[PDB]
Amino acid sequence: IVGGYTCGANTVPYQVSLNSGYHFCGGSLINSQWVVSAAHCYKSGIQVRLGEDNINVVEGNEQFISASKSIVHPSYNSNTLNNDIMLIKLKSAASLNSRVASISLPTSCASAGTQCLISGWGNTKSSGTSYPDVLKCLKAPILSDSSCKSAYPGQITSNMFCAGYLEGGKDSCQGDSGGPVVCSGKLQGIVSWGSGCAQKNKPGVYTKVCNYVSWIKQTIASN
Ligand SMILES: COc1ccc(O)c(-c2nc3cc(C(N)=[NH2+])ccc3[nH]2)c1
Numbered sequence: 001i002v003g004g005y006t007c008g009a010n011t012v013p014y015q016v017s018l019n020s021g022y023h024f025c026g027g028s029l030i031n032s033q034w035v036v037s038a039a040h041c042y043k044s045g046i047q048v049r050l051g052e053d054n055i056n057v058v059e060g061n062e063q064f065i066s067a068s069k070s071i072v073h074p075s076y077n078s079n080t081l082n083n084d085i086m087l088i089k090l091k092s093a094a095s096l097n098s099r100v101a102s103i104s105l106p107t108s109c110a111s112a113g114t115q116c117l118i119s120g121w122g123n124t125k126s127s128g129t130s131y132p133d134v135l136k137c138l139k140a141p142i143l144s145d146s147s148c149k150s151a152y153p154g155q156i157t158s159n160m161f162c163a164g165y166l167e168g169g170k171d172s173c174q175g176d177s178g179g180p181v182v183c184s185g186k187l188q189g190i191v192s193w194g195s196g197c198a199q200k201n202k203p204g205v206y207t208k209v210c211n212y213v214s215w216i217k218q219t220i221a222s223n
């Protein structure tokens with residue numbers, strides 16, 4: 001997260017760290033046994049880490065659960081990143097409390113101008129790598145589709161939305177992928193891609209979760 005602030009331990013209780021021996025992606029807890037992340041975060045050997053704050057120290061509140069299966073969206077395209085969403089089922093259910101809680105799925109999509117909270121342990125520099133130990137937060141607004149499409153002409157599908165600052169300086173970055181974009185208490189986006197990080201006129205692009213709620217519910221209902 002570039003230009004963000006320290007969230008504070010356990011203030012984002014649905015945030016998970018996808019770990020394969022190091023933090024590689026973010027994710028969101030949607031019920032005690034399922035996590036939602038981005039399809040480009042897929043790999044086998046995924047341990048889901050809940051209740052985290054400093055990902056390098058065990059401080060208490062952490063629950064490490066192995067993924068029983070990951071379900072990448074069948075229409076995911078790794079060249080365009082269209083349908084960049086993945087569901088991970090956990091081997092065992094997490095104990096939900098105040099530090100580990102699920103986030104609700106939206107009933108409607110969000111509008112441009114909606115302010116959302118993006119969080120993650122991804123890079124904090126737009127030039128070079130500085131990964132933090134604790135979770136960073138950034139409040140960013142969803143942008144209008146016309147500004148999004150003028151920024152990435154021909155690269156935005158109806159399953160993507162832009163959120164961020166066109167003047168540059170604040171954005172999500174590498175390491176943040178798969179994590180949550182929460183607006184008004186509802187999961188509206190999944191960190192997906194961007195051109196560099198916090199560069200002017202290059203806002204972050206996110207998976208538009210409101211287009212997948214029936215797919216998520218139908219898939220969880222059958223697995
Ligand atoms: C270069 O290697 C990788 C590998 C996986 C990623 O998700 C990313 C990545 N770049 C990203 C850029 C952004 C952004 N909003 N500017 C957000 C997530 C990203 N994730 C980069």
Ligand SMILES: [Ca+2]
Nearest residue numbers: 054057058059
């Ligand atoms: Ca920790």
